[PDB]
Design a protein around this ligand. Structure first.
Ligand SMILES: *CC(=O)N(C)Cc1cnn(-c2ccccc2)c1
Ligand SMILES: *CC(=O)N(C)Cc1cnn(-c2ccccc2)c1
Lengths: 237, 237
């Protein structure tokens, strides 16, 4: 069931009532945002993994851009863009709100999200390594963006980006910091002490911990991704 | 009072109670989003224009990135990023909501906002013209992005991007289409009929009409902007 669907696969059936479907990929950091929210809010759902190297024809009817995550509810309504799927889930399901209701506090979370906006592209580029001379410069980009996040935590004087308790903004940023060890980028935070403390606090969170991927599984994916293998998305069953 | 403040100007005083302040620029399309929301919701406010060619030192304390629009309330709280200032105003002030309360409908508006995300950078690049051979290709980029917006209106079968009545998403996209005539880009919509009808419907909206800038004022700004003049932001008093 967890095996990714690719080109030639049958379009899935309708989403049953009382459940929501996520079109994801087990190693995708953008899809992980949504999976963190689904877990934190205890939402009943089904997972359909997509082979991003060999996409099913029908997935373009889910998202014309062909990117995961994509949410589909029992009414056939489709929601995509990882931050949008997270806010939609926060609003459409009961329980504690991950995004604060206060207009100013909610705006601050989205202001930090904008501040982080360069990091996913920097990670994407770093994975597809070109030469040794580029690495030291691409790591200089990481230090610059991570100091922006350090200044936020310094000015807030709190453990998390939305206060002294975990909230939406922390789950939105976490997937890229989770992969820092597997990418051998642990030195890019050696000058951001509050950010380093935030990473360890995140690893202790029950939701984050339950969705943690082993160092070996990250490596297995990365190796097959650099080989452009259509088995990359299915590493480690 | 409407004259823009620049380097060497005195930091402004506190925002009085019952009012909100916008740090803007009369010809900035990003700041225009916020000004459209302030008008549509009938919000009492004050406008401080910033000389973007000769920024005041204190403006970096309002937005570390030094970009307009920036909101400041009586509590000294600062809000920036044009879409964030618009949603904050919609949530923190009474009256009709510009963003629908329905989680799915609100998500769709933000999905269209993401779809439009390439157009502001394409406009920014087009203003700073390099050569005649680039123009036809940069206009091919516009047709490609405008067809994405055409497909939305076609699939929705409504006059606006959020239904048969104007809503937030329309004010968020409008400033770039308003400037299409002054930029001589009217041929980039000659293959998007619903988008052309949306533009004329927008021009009839009371809020849009009250914030319309004359063709002569757009030209006066553009000429001085291409000359890198610090008088550009203050064209036409
Ligand atoms: C959904 C998506 O954009 N991808 C699957 C690309 C991607 C970006 N970052 N990763 C990543 C990085 C390090 C380790 C595992 C996965 C994948
Ligand atoms: C706030 C900002 O980004 N600017 C002032 C730059 C800008 C982008 N587009 N315009 C523009 C385009 C055509 C006509 C007037 C203004 C300014």
């Amino acid at each position: 069931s967890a095996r990714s669907l690719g080109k030639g696969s049958a379009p899935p059936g309708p989403v049953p009532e009382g459940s929501i479907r996520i079109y994801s990929m087990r190693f995708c950091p953008f899809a992980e945002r949504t999976r963190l929210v689904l877990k934190a809010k205890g939402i009943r759902h089904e997972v359909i993994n997509i082979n991003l190297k060999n996409k099913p024809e029908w997935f373009f009817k889910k998202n014309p851009f062909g990117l995961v995550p994509v949410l589909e509810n029992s009414q056939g309504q489709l929601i995509y863009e990882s931050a949008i799927t997270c806010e939609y889930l926060d609003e459409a399901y009961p329980g504690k709100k991950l995004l604060p209701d206060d207009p100013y506090e909610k705006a601050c979370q989205k202001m930090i999200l904008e501040l982080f906006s360069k990091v996913p592209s920097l990670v994407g580029s770093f994975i597809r390594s070109q030469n040794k001379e580029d690495y030291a410069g691409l790591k200089e980009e990481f230090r610059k963006e991570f100091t922006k996040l350090e200044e936020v935590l310094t000015n807030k004087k709190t453990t998390f980006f939305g206060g002294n308790s975990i909230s939406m903004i922390d789950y939105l940023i976490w997937p890229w910091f989770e992969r820092l060890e597997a990418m051998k980028l642990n030195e890019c935070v050696d000058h951001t002490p509050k950010l380093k403390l935030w990473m360890a606090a995140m690893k202790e969170d029950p939701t984050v911990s339950a969705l943690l991927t082993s160092e070996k599984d990250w490596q297995g994916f990365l190796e097959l991704y650099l080989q452009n293998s259509p088995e990359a998305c299915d590493y480690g069953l």
